[PDB]
Amino acid sequence: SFVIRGDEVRQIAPGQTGKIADYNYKLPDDFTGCVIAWNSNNLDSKVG
Amino acid sequence: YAWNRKRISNCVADYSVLYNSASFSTFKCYGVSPTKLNDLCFTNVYAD
Known part of the structure; x- marks a missing residue:
């Protein structure tokens, strides 16, 4: 499982x-x- | 439509710097792997 970026998928x-x-x-x-990839913006994207 | 053509020759080429640049969104090569490009030597290289 990974943290990879969107363009990266x-x-x-x-x-x-x-x-x-x-x-x-x-x-x-x-x-x-x-x-299997799904963007989890909610889980890990904080302001800053 | 006007596309410019530049002729490059009589030198040595360091392409790896070009490859190792985060700056290019798309770097696709048809025929050369971007790596190992340093190993090739050509009569004329044209840049558009």
């Missing part, structure tokens, strides 16, 4: 490359699973 997938995809988390090419 695309990166949690097999082939992609990018900031998170390289340094933070790397899904394998062969990945067998699902990627």
Whole structure:
């Protein structure tokens, strides 16, 4: 489970490359699973 | 419609700085991985 950014979500997938995809988390090419994403602005977005 | 073309040649290129810039929203390369780009040498590079 992650805190990743919205524009970033695309990166949690097999082939992609990018900031998170390289340094933070790397899904394998062969990945067998699902990627479930839902923005939780309410839970963690405070003023400031 | 007017698109400008610039000719770049006779030098050495550091593309990694370009890749390692947070500044570009989209950096998609068709044919080169953005990394390992430093390894290539070309006759003429055109920038639009």
